[PDB]
Amino acid sequence: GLMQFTLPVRLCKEIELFHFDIGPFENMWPGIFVYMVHRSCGTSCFELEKLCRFIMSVKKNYRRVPYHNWKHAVTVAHCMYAILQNNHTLFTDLERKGLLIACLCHDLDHRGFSNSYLQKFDHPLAALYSTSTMEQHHFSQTVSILQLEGHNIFSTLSSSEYEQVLEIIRKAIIATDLALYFGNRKQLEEMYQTGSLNLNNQSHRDRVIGLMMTACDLCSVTKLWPVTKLTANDIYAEFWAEGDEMKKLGIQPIPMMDRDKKDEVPQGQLGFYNAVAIPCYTTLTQILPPTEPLLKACRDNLSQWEKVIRGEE
Numbered sequence: 434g435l436m437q438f439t440l441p442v443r444l445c446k447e448i449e450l451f452h453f454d455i456g457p458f459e460n461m462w463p464g465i466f467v468y469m470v471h472r473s474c475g476t477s478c479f480e481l482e483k484l485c486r487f488i489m490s491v492k493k494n495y496r497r498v499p500y501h502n503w504k505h506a507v508t509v510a511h512c513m514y515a516i517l518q519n520n521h522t523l524f525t526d527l528e529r530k531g532l533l534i535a536c537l538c539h540d541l542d543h544r545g546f547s548n549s550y551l552q553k554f555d556h557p558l559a560a561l562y563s564t565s566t567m568e569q570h571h572f573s574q575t576v577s578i579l580q581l582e583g584h585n586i587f588s589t590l591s592s593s594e595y596e597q598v599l600e601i602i603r604k605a606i607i608a609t610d611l612a613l614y615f616g617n618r619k620q621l622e623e624m625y626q627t628g629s630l631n632l633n634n635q636s637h638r639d640r641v642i643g644l645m646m647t648a649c650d651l652c653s654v655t656k657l658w659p660v661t662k663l664t665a666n667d668i669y670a671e672f673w674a675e676g677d678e679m680k681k682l683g684i685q686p687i688p689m690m691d692r693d694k695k696d697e698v699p700q701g702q703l704g705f706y707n708a709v710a711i712p713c714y715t716t717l718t719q720i721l722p723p724t725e726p727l728l729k730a731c732r733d734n735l736s737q738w739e740k741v742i743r744g745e746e
């Protein structure tokens with residue numbers, strides 16, 4: 434109860450910043466998460482013993498893939514921590530509880546393959562879940578782990594408060610399906626622009642949390658350039674393995690997934706920043722002004738990929 438988590442001084446200061454990198458010491462990542470829950474939510478949000486047992490079971494259910502791994506989970510939770518801490522008064526008690534957990538769980542048991550590859554392979558998960566296939570699975574794995582003995586971190590919530598937090602987590606995880614992001618951001622853009630956006634309207638809040646989930650999920654493009662650049666190598670190592678598997682099924686993959694077309698990576702990142710990332714952080718900054726450093730960092734990284742193309746690196 435009187436037992437804080439404290440971080441060394443450099444991590445204590447830099448963890449508050451949006452561009453923080455959680456580091457290569459895997460054994461410190463649980464401590465970093467608990468630290469963030471404690472300042473974001475409170476030392477009373479969760480029973481320490483249950484929360485530590487939940488974190489360790491979540492870790493165990495992330496696989497040893499190049500990108501969609503335990504480090505990605507904790508990275509996405511840290512971006513959500515930074516958003517919540519820079520927007521103190523905008524979020525409910527239940528939302529603070531649910532959103533860091535949703536972020537830690539959002540890619541549980543990822544195999545390093547897209548929804549499209551599962552559907553072409555005819556994976557059983559593609560018959561169980563016809564849209565947002567991996568995302569319905571991540572939510573299903575989250576509920577499985579919450580139901581293990583001694584793992585119910587929400588045990589103190591009422592029946593209806595429990596149902597609300599699980600519903601925040603479900604919508605937050607479904608929203609990480611990038612297919613859904615384009616339409617969500619268009620609606621939010623129109624709502625903001627015609628001044629109909631209303632944070633007392635639950636369906637509006639839902640959309641705003643959706644966009645926060647996309648922003649946290651893509652936060653690799655908001656880091657210092659050497660982090661951004663080295664993370665892109667992991668991102669492509671997955672896509673290229675999926676491309677290899679597409680070629681094994683007798684299907685030319687898209688160029689993004691074809692290792693034979695490595696050379697167009699710089700131009701592929703430009704389209705990504707222009708079509709996905711910059712629009713995401715722009716609309717997020719319009720709705721939540723203190724998230725502007727994510728947009729500024731994204732713009733700085735777009736300019737670095739421009740320099741790669743001009744052969745200045």
Ligand SMILES: Cc1nc2ccc(CCc3nc(-c4ccccc4)cn3C)nn2c1C
Pocket residue numbers: 650651652653654665668688689690694695696697698699700701702704705
């Ligand atoms: C956080 C984050 N999330 C993502 C998701 C996808 C991508 C790849 C983006 C892309 N590359 C290509 C491409 C590459 C080589 C040859 C031809 C085309 C196409 N496109 C859209 N980057 N990414 C990042 C950085």
Ligand SMILES: [Mg+2]
Pocket residue numbers: 539540567609610
């Ligand atoms: Mg995902």
Ligand SMILES: [Zn+2]
Pocket residue numbers: 505509539540609650
């Ligand atoms: Zn993710």
